[PDB]
């Protein structure tokens, strides 16, 4: 089956606006890939959407554990 996961997908349900370049903008309804993580601090993570990059409230977001249906 599967070894590893390359990077982590989620689901954004709480829609954002980015208020400098850094910061990201995101909607309700879409994934971001998870680019890198951030420090010990929860709240705060890196995902590419639209080919950008930049920082999002992790809270805004969460973490999606795997597809049952489609």
């Given at each position: 089956?599967?070894?590893?996961?390359?990077?982590d997908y989620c689901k954004v349900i709480?829609?954002?606006?980015?208020?400098?370049?850094?910061?990201?903008?995101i909607?309700?309804?879409?994934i971001v890939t998870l680019?890198?993580?951030?420090?010990?601090?929860?709240?705060?993570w890196?995902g590419?959407?639209?080919?950008?990059?930049?920082?999002f409230?992790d809270?805004?977001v969460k973490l999606l554990?795997?597809?049952?249906?489609?």
């Amino acid at each position: 089956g599967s070894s590893g996961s390359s990077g982590d997908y989620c689901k954004v349900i709480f829609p954002y606006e980015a208020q400098n370049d850094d910061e990201l903008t995101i909607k309700e309804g879409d994934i971001v890939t998870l680019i890198n993580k951030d420090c010990i601090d929860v709240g705060w993570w890196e995902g590419e959407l639209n080919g950008r990059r930049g920082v999002f409230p992790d809270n805004f977001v969460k973490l999606l554990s795997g597809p049952s249906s489609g």
